[PDB]
């Protein structure tokens, strides 16, 4: 149904060895599409995908002296962070922005989100409604205050509700068949001795497309919860994700534990048992 | 496509 | 709120001339523009803190305008040619992307021999 | 660029007067409008960030990315208004470009 275009930024200052690294990266749900890096050679945003592939050189000169620009504010943006936590000159800090914008079944605005954390720590973000702002912080208000003063919450709105999702729809479209698609898991299950008196079922699910998935193991009905073990979701390479969950069984009972497979890209919830 | 205005804390 | 200083200047050509324009205390942001008579507003170099991200556009060499020692910000031109003769606007910004740049009264160059 | 007519316009006392403006990279975003009066300088007095009708009492400036215009509305022109007119987009990220500009006449 949702649709997400959401942008990345990461800024890490760096004592003694020239101006701070700065990292941008853009996104359309879990395709990524540009990338930005302040160290490469070119110093131009880079396409990845075939349908920003197609956009042309108008495009291209028009977001790298944006980017760069964008760069620009976040290196400026590190000193003021260190005026207001008062810290040391000499020391490795990191910010980093998202902001992004989601488009419902039908393909119209659903939600926003911009947001901004140092260090690692939450610093200030957007709430839902887009006309109030969270600041996580005990001296995070002071930002708080400031941007209020050029409605930057209300400038902000325009672009997110603006061209955000014109040119997510776009996108959408410049490659229909790389977005708009929806890949279904090849599942199977495994099965590990540790010992004579201790097993392992592992249940697979290879290349998938989105990343949204709900595993969860089942012992006679009943929600399995003790002895499983399972990962965070892992790219695969061709634009496809992969992702585990682990059980430890005695050695005999195999028929009692039946797996539970959750997507949207499959008619009903798979089961798999122990052949 | 990327945001236009900008804004420092 | 902002002034350019001086008044104005009439020079002869060759002169060198340093351009001060004393911005809005608290912004972090700057633009040159020249503007004359038959001329529309004409860009020059924006910064930011004190790094020159834009420097194209300038007519030559000659030109070269520096913001470094703090938050006032200069502009030099060596060698004064007569095609400079225009009035120097300065703008200045709170933060980069934000709305209304305000202009200082603006200096009149004038270039004669 | 950003192309724009220069007219000069002259409009009488009251009626309603109108600057237009265009620009080329369609994914702008960033539209204001600066007025200044003889050789004094620029003072911003309408900006527009999406597609619609913003007003500031008598000015009405109106945006339309369709067809890559933004236009402004004096109502009750007053011949305190006579001044070049003048539109401005955000080349690049940031960094404002501007057209030559509309001088106005209110024949009062």
């Known amino acids: 149904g949702s649709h997400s275009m959401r942008y990345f930024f990461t800024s890490v200052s760096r004592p003694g060895r020239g101006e701070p690294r700065f990292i941008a990266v853009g996104y359309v749900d879990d395709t990524q599409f540009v990338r930005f890096d302040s160290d490469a050679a070119s110093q131009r945003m880079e396409p990845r995908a075939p349908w920003i592939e197609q956009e042309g050189p108008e495009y291209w000169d028009g977001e790298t002296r944006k980017v760069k620009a964008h760069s620009q504010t976040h290196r400026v943006d590190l000193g003021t962070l260190r005026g207001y936590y008062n810290q040391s000159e000499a020391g490795s800090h990191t910010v980093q922005r998202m902001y992004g914008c989601d488009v419902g079944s039908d393909w119209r605005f659903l939600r926003g989100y911009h947001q901004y954390a140092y260090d690692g720590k939450d610093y200030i973000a957007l709430k839902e409604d887009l006309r109030s702002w969270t600041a996580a912080d005990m001296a995070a208000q002071t930002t708080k205050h400031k941007w209020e003063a050029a409605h930057v919450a209300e400038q902000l709105r325009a672009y997110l509700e603006g061209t955000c999702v014109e040119w997510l729809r776009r996108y959408l479209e410049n490659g229909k068949e790389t977005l708009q698609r929806t890949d279904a898991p090849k599942t199977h299950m495994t099965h590990h001795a540790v010992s004579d008196h201790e097993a392992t079922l592992r249940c697979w699910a290879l290349s998938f497309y989105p990343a949204e998935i709900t595993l969860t193991w089942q012992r006679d009905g009943e929600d399995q919860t003790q002895d499983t073990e399972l990962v965070e979701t892992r790219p695969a390479g061709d634009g496809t994700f992969q992702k585990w969950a682990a059980v430890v069984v005695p050695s005999g009972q195999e028929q009692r534990y039946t797996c539970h497979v959750q997507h949207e890209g499959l008619p009903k919830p798979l089961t798999l048992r122990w052949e | 496509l990327l945001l236009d205005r900008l804004n420092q804390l | 709120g902002v002034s350019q200083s001086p008044s104005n200047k009439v020079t002869e050509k060759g002169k060198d001339v340093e351009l001060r324009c004393d911005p809005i205390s608290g912004h972090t942001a700057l633009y040159w523009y020249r503007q004359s008579l038959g001329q529309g507003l004409e860009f020059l170099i924006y910064f930011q803190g004190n790094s020159a991200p834009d420097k194209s556009g300038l007519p030559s060499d000659r030109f070269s305008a520096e913001r470094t020692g703090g938050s006032v910000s200069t502009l030099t031109i060596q060698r004064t040619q007569q095609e400079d003769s225009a009035v120097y606007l300065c703008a200045s910004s709170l933060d980069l992307g934000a709305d209304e740049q305000f202009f200082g009264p603006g200096t009149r160059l004038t270039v004669l021999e | 660029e950003v192309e724009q007519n220069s007219g000069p316009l002259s409009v009488p006392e009251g009626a309603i007067a109108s600057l237009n403006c265009t620009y080329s990279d369609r994914g702008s975003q960033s539209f204001f409008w600066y007025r200044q009066y003889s050789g004094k300088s620029p003072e911003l007095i309408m900006f527009?960030?999406?597609?619609g009708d913003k007003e500031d009492g008598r000015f009405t400036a109106q945006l339309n990315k369709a067809s890559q215009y933004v236009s402004l509305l004096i109502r009750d022109s007053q011949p305190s208004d006579s001044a070049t007119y003048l539109c401005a987009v955000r080349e690049g990220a940031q960094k404002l470009v501007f057209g030559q500009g509309t001088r106005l006449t209110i024949n009062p």
């Open positions: 527009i960030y999406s597609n």
